[PDB]
Structure formats: C-alpha cells, structure tokens
C-alpha cells in the first residue's frame, strides 16, 4: 500500500507512535517519507546481505527473520514479510523497540541525515489528527 501523508500520520497516531520516546508524529512521517516514500512494500538490499522492509525500512540484521541474513537476530519476533503489510501494526510495534534501543531515531540513518533538526511538523501540516 502507498499511504497518503495525512493517512499515514493518522495510522501512526492510532498505533501510539506520536511522541513515542519523545519523537513527535512529524519525525515518524518524515522518516517514513525518506525510507519508503510511504510504500509498505518498499525493500532495499544492503551490501552486508541484510534487507530493509516496509514503511520504515526495518533491517533483517537485528529486527525480523527473512531466513537469508546469516548470524542475524529477530528481536521483533516477526517474519520481515509482516513489515510489508497494508496494516502498519507490525512496523509500528517493531519501530517502538528500535527507537528504544539507545540511539533514538538515529537508528534510521535517513532520519538523521534528512529529518533530524528540520521543521518536521511540516509533515503533519493540514492533517486532521
Ligand atoms: Na534476522
């Protein structure tokens, strides 16, 4: 599924992402914009052979099982495919564990490089939330 901006903002809020670990909804929407362009089916193969899955491009090295990332963990206790669902529940639950890991949203390199320190509230501007 390709979400609308305000549509994704609403889904993330509904699943308690807004101000989760102190990160406003605009941070989450910005990260999703640059990770996936709001496409739940987005995948990206990394050089290390791990893969990134879904609206927030969660990686198989730590967070999900894809059966093809040697020596990897599955800390969200999910098949990586669950992260490609039109239903963002698995992505949001897993993102809550990731953003709790110690480095906050710096875990998403694209959030650090493209969202961090920017006017992120622009990403929920005009949305009925
Ligand atoms: Na894994």
UniProtKB/Swiss-Prot annotation:
Molecular functions per Gene Ontology: beta-N-acetylglucosaminidase activity; identical protein binding; lysozyme activity
GO cellular component assignments: cytoplasm; endoplasmic reticulum; extracellular space
Catalyzed reactions: Hydrolysis of (1->4)-beta-linkages between N-acetylmuramic acid and N-acetyl-D-glucosamine residues in a peptidoglycan and between N-acetyl-D-glucosamine residues in chitodextrins
Record's subunit section: Monomer.
Domain (C-type lysozyme): residue spans on this chain: 1-129
Residues reported in the UniProt entry to bind substrate: 101
EC numbers: 3.2.1.17
Keywords attached to this entry: Allergen, Antimicrobial, Bacteriolytic enzyme, Disulfide bond, Glycosidase, Hydrolase, Secreted, Signal
Name of the protein in its database record: Lysozyme C
Tissue/organ expression: In the egg white and polymorphonuclear leukocytes.
UniProt gene name: LYZ
SUPFAM superfamilies linked to this entry: Lysozyme-like
Disulfide bonds: 6-127, 30-115, 64-80, 76-94
Compartments it resides in: Secreted
Active site, per annotation: 35, 52
GO biological process terms held by the UniProt record: cell wall macromolecule catabolic process; defense response to bacterium; defense response to Gram-negative bacterium; defense response to Gram-positive bacterium; killing of cells of another organism
Physiological role: Lysozymes have primarily a bacteriolytic function; those in tissues and body fluids are associated with the monocyte-macrophage system and enhance the activity of immunoagents. Has bacteriolytic activity against M.luteus.
Family, as annotated: Belongs to the glycosyl hydrolase 22 family.
Main location (coarse class): secreted
Record-linked InterPro entries: Glyco_hydro_22, Glyco_hydro_22_CS, Glyco_hydro_22_lys, Lysozyme-like_dom_sf
Note, other: Lysozyme C is capable of both hydrolysis and transglycosylation; it also shows a slight esterase activity. It acts rapidly on both peptide-substituted and unsubstituted peptidoglycan, and slowly on chitin oligosaccharides.
């Amino acid at each position: 599924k390709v979400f609308g901006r305000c549509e994704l903002a609403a889904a993330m809020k509904r699943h308690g992402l807004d101000n989760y670990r102190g990160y406003s909804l605009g941070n989450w929407v910005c990260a999703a914009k640059f990770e996936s362009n709001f496409n739940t089916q987005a995948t990206n193969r990394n050089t290390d052979g791990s893969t990134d899955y879904g609206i927030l491009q969660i990686n198989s090295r730590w967070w999900c099982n894809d059966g093809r990332t040697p020596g990897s963990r599955n800390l969200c206790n999910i098949p990586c495919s669950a992260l490609l669902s039109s239903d963002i529940t698995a992505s949001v639950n897993c993102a809550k564990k990731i953003v709790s890991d110690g480095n906050g949203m710096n875990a998403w390199v694209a959030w650090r490089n493209r969202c961090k320190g920017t006017d992120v509230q622009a990403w929920i501007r005009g949305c009925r939330l």
